[PDB]
Design a binder for these strands. Structure first.
Ligand SMILES: [Mg+2]
Ligand SMILES: [Mg+2]
Ligand SMILES: [Mg+2]
Ligand SMILES: [Mg+2]
Ligand SMILES: [Mg+2]
Ligand SMILES: [Mg+2]
Ligand SMILES: [Mg+2]
Ligand SMILES: [Mg+2]
Ligand SMILES: [Mg+2]
Ligand SMILES: [Mg+2]
Ligand SMILES: [Mg+2]
Ligand SMILES: [Mg+2]
Ligand SMILES: [Mg+2]
Ligand SMILES: [Mg+2]
Ligand SMILES: [Mg+2]
Ligand SMILES: [Mg+2]
Ligand SMILES: [Mg+2]
Ligand SMILES: [Mg+2]
Ligand SMILES: [Mg+2]
Ligand SMILES: [Mg+2]
Ligand SMILES: [Mg+2]
Ligand SMILES: [Mg+2]
Ligand SMILES: [Mg+2]
Ligand SMILES: [Mg+2]
Ligand SMILES: [Mg+2]
Ligand SMILES: [Mg+2]
Ligand SMILES: [Mg+2]
Ligand SMILES: [Mg+2]
Lengths: 122, 201, 97, 176, 127, 46
RNA sequence: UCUCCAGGCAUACGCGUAUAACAACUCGGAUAACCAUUGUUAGUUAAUCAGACUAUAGGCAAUAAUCACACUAUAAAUCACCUAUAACUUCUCUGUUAACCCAACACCGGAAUGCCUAAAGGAAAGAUCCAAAAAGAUAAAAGGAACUCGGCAAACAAGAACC
RNA sequence: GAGCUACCUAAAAACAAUUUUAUGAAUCAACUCGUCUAUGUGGCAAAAUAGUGAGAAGAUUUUUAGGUAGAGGUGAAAAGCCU
RNA sequence: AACUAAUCCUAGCCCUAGCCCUACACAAAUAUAAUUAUACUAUUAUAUAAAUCAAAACAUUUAUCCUACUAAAAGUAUUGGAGA
């Protein structure tokens, strides 16, 4: 006579059955049955100063919208990296080994913000 | 849903909810397919009624239901109905338009009003322009007021609307940095600790 | 019994469309063509019954030979069961022995 | 303060509230990262006030004034989110060449299907993790029959669909 | 943030910072009678009471003294025209008590502010 | 005695006897799941 | 306010919004009133009640319980403490409503433990009439098993003996 | 398919008052069972209700979780029981 | 002199022909009592198909089931309680 179709949650079942509703953990449980919160595990909101800011939620109807051009890897490379290499190549002071000079990173290890595997949230 | 029927009233309106309930299973309406490129009638145009009770007259197009191949003409193909009826009051008689199919009207040459067939063609820029087969001329795209009722030119900014000049200001400087990295630098936050190794699998 | 209360819409048949006009052409391909082609080769239909005829038991067994190895599991299970039913009817039942 | 969870006191009780257009993606692209970070919170506080008003209208059983305001804000926040994502996506390609931020693989499950598996973060390597080892990424031979049955079932659905389209065209050509 | 991965933390790791927030809340009028300091909120199911404290103090500059939360079961009793149950979503309610003796009360939104003797004959006729 | 009441409900028993982990424990139970997937059942297990 | 009746309040297991207000009067309650029905809005707040809760390696145990004293008995009977190693200030998450569960039903049925026995919880008669037959209770002159397969059932009896 | 029932494993629980003694003793509640009669028979109930009866510190009764599966299991043997 | 009813046409489907496939579906969650962000405790189909049934019972035996190009040689040579 049990309901097979409704979702299985902790409001159901006996006392000893418990599970989470999706909130992230913020601490650890030791022996002696004591909870110990960790400060670094609690998310911190980075809020900017909004004094003197000119932008608002809405825009005027008379503002012309622009043709859509999604950014691509090619476009970013040309705007930022291409000019410096071109000047150095003309001078002849360019080599493959020193690509790091132009901003290339060999590996993501050591960086606080790693691009793969991502180690930070939105 | 396959059993949805498109009608005069706007989709999502109170009347539309009443006519198309979830449990309605009426026969489909058979509609000839017309390509998006080939469609050549737009709101604000002037057309001529080839046949019907009001055959021979000309009017302005006020609505277009693409799904049904419908074109609605102001003050034509008309019948009479009371509006605002209540339990006591009769209401006020008005004249109601009825939709006409696309093949039942023809576009009118602007220079001298007369039915004309048209062909799409490319200009120097390649933007498509309607061209009349007879007495070749370009029929310009008409201008129609926005449905929502907004008039851009007369629009006046409110307290929470950004000015046009502010909206178009360009402040982006391309660089190989994430949004997270930039914000920390500007705000002055300093962190030196690093995550221990984690195994992904 | 209940009957229609209105006449059904009329049926209009075109007797001179292309399919009807040219029916029969090339049925004499052999005799008038030096016998390079047999008229049976002009037939369109299932692979296992082009230019052939048989009773239901024969049709079932012939279908299995031609396309039995390219069939779906459940369709083949039903075909095999039909064969055995027809085998027992035609070989064990009937008025005449 | 809490007063920011409500509209300007003057507007309370009004039937309409004038509002502008929502931000388009192209306009946002011109702005810098720092500007976008601030713009996010400006939109966020507008969103909370609109959600607050919507619930209160239901409690009092009245129409919500100018409901189209909510849709504009939600659209704007979506465009901000993708614009930031586009910049990150391009930068990741240049530095690593990977098309996804999260590691994964193509694997076969115990039912005979091919699925993309997203990895998780662990403190220890896989060969020492006894909870992970109980998970099976292979199919045994009794599954082969069901693989064929799935393929045939999918074949029947496709045949019926194409047949129906051909019959519908016959009706259209007759009518027109 | 919701629907995102958090970096795993181990001894000696950095602080966890979310620069753009995915949580949206709404202020609700109490159904019952509550003390003057208390306020009610509807919050996403993934939010903790700790998160609500930081959310209000930093985004809205509001001092908070205590927080309590509960999960409300949504009804799954109504059926559609095919006799299939309709589920009202479960949601989370938060009670916040202000600090420093400050007081709050829900504002008053929506403050408001023919001729009997000749029956049946049209009067149009002048004859 | 009066019959008709043989179902004495218990969630721990129900999940252990007919649950997801129980079905996957043996090859016969895995084939139970495959049949219900091919039929299209909305409920594969308790 | 009056007349009468006498298993109630909590926890466990189970159930899953049946909970509360307003509005409806179609369907549901085997009839009305009223809702247990329909729609809309609301609700159950815990470092103490309840659940989950990962430092490591060694060394070692003769003597029940029952008011545990006396006292025997027989069925022979609930981690601690030490030795070294390591760490060196903490509150998040989940349960909490109800006239409720298993029996096709608002079923005279079945359902564990603690406290208590009316201070808690309830209503046998829709209106009227006073026939036969049927069911249940109480009273009966004189007689006292003559009844019946049989003292079955009932009794102001509830006792004795033998195979 | 052992959430009913048969038997077993582990962890738990209940037994007033009175007479005997020192107990598968006695009287008799709770609780467990079901002798006899009437009512009921599409019943309140696919085995009940009303009375009347047997045991009630033990081979006692009860709760929670686990085990044995059909050529089989379980059985103080009724060819009983296994939704 | 009308109640209960009755009239309707298209939603889709069926059998062939043709052709391999490359469909493997935002974020997040799930093998734990699935759909619960992190260690405890390891993980693994199957020895020959049988019987009903026909032989008017039944015991050796019983087409297809247990697939290998169409048409013919041919229901021929052969096998069989030499019988089905
Ligand atoms: Mg049942
Ligand atoms: Mg109620
Ligand atoms: Mg009412
Ligand atoms: Mg209700
Ligand atoms: Mg709580
Ligand atoms: Mg506690
Ligand atoms: Mg543990
Ligand atoms: Mg309670
Ligand atoms: Mg019953
Ligand atoms: Mg009944
Ligand atoms: Mg009382
Ligand atoms: Mg009476
Ligand atoms: Mg008497
Ligand atoms: Mg007498
Ligand atoms: Mg006698
Ligand atoms: Mg006699
Ligand atoms: Mg007697
Ligand atoms: Mg059992
Ligand atoms: Mg039991
Ligand atoms: Mg006693
Ligand atoms: Mg018994
Ligand atoms: Mg006795
Ligand atoms: Mg006794
Ligand atoms: Mg005794
Ligand atoms: Mg015997
Ligand atoms: Mg016998
Ligand atoms: Mg049975
Ligand atoms: Mg035989």
């Amino acid at each position: 006579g049990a309901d097979r179709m409704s979702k299985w949650t902790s409001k159901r079942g006996p006392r000893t059955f418990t599970k989470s509703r999706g909130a992230k953990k913020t601490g650890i449980y030791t022996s002696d049955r004591k909870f110990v919160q960790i400060k670094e595990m609690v998310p911190e909101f980075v809020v900017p100063d909004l004094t003197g800011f000119k932008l608002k939620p809405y825009v005027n109807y008379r503002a012309p919208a622009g043709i859509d051009t999604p950014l691509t890897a090619k476009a970013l490379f040309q705007e930022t990296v291409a000019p410096a290499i071109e000047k150095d190549f003309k001078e002849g002071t360019f080599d493959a080994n020193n690509l790091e000079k132009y901003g290339f990173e060999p590996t993501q290890e050591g960086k606080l913000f790693q691009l793969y595997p991502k180690n930070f949230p939105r | 849903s396959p059993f949805y029927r498109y009608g005069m009233s706007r989709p999502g309106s109170i009347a539309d909810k009443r006519k198309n309930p979830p449990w309605s299973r009426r026969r489909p309406v058979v509609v000839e397919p017309i390509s998006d490129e080939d469609w050549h009638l737009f709101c604000g145009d002037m057309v001529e009624i080839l046949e019907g009770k009001d055959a021979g007259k000309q009017g302005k197009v006020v609505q277009v239901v693409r799904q049904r191949n419908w074109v609605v003409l102001e003050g034509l193909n008309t019948h009479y109905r009371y509006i605002g009826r209540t339990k006591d009051h009769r209401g006020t008689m008005i004249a109601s338009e009825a939709p006409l199919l696309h093949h039942q009207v023809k576009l009118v040459d602007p220079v001298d009003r007369k039915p004309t067939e048209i062909q799409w063609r490319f200009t120097e820029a390649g933007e498509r322009v309607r061209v009349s087969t007879r007495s070749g001329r370009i029929i310009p795209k008409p201008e129609f007021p926005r449905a929502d009722g907004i008039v851009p030119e007369t629009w006046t900014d409110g307290p929470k609307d950004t000015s046009v000049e502010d909206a178009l200001e360009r402040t982006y400087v391309p660089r190989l940095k994430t949004l997270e990295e930039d914000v920390m630098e500007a705000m002055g936050i300093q962190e030196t600790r690093r995550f221990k190794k984690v195994y992904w699998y | 019994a209940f009957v229609r209360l209105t006449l059904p819409p009329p049926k209009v048949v075109d007797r001179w469309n292309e399919k009807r006009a040219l029916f029969g052409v090339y049925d004499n391909i052999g005799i008038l063509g030096n016998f390079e082609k047999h008229p049976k080769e002009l037939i369109k239909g299932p692979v296992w019954l082009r230019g052939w005829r048989g009773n239901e038991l024969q049709r079932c067994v012939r279908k299995k030979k031609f396309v039995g190895n390219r069939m779906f599991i459940e369709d083949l299970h039903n075909l095999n069961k039909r064969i055995s039913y027809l085998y027992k009817h035609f070989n064990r039942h009937g008025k005449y022995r | 303060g809490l007063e920011e969870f409500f509209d300007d006191p003057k507007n309370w009780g009004e039937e309409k509230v004038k509002s502008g257009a929502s931000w388009t993606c192209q306009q946002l692209r011109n702005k810098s990262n720092e500007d976008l970070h601030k713009l996010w919170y400006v939109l966020l506080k507008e969103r909370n006030m609109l959600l607050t008003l919507e619930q209160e209208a239901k409690r009092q059983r009245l129409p919500m004034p100018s409901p189209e305001r909510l849709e504009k804000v939600v659209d704007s926040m979506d465009n901000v989110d993708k614009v930031v994502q586009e910049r990150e996506d391009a930068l990741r390609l240049l530095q690593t060449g990977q098309e996804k931020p999260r590691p994964g693989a193509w694997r076969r499950d115990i039912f005979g299907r091919i699925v993309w598996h997203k990895f998780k973060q662990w403190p220890i390597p896989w060969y020492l993790n006894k909870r992970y080892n109980r998970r099976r990424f292979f199919a045994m031979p009794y599954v082969d029959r069901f693989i064929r049955l799935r393929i045939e079932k999918h074949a029947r659905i496709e045949a019926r669909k194409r047949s129906l389209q051909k019959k519908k065209e016959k009706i259209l050509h007759a009518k027109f | 943030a919701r629907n995102v991965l958090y970096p795993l933390y181990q001894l000696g790791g950095p602080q966890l910072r979310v620069f753009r927030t995915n949580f949206f809340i709404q202020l609700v009028r109490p159904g019952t009678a509550q003390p003057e300091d208390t306020v009610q909120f509807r919050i996403p199911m993934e939010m903790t009471r700790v998160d609500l404290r930081n959310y209000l103090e930093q985004i809205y500059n509001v001092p908070v003294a205590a927080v309590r939360t509960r999960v409300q079961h949504g009804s799954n009793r109504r059926r559609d025209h095919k006799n299939v149950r309709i589920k009202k979503p479960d949601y989370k309610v938060a009670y916040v008590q202000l600090a420093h003796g400050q007081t709050f009360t829900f504002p008053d939104l929506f403050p408001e502010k023919s001729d009997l003797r000749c029956p049946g004959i049209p009067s149009w006729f002048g004859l | 005695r009066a019959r008709g009441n043989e179902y004495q409900p218990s969630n721990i028993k129900r999940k252990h006897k007919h649950g997801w982990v129980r079905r996957l424990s043996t090859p016969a139970g895995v084939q139970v799941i495959l049949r219900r997937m091919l039929k299209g059942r909305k409920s594969l297990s308790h």
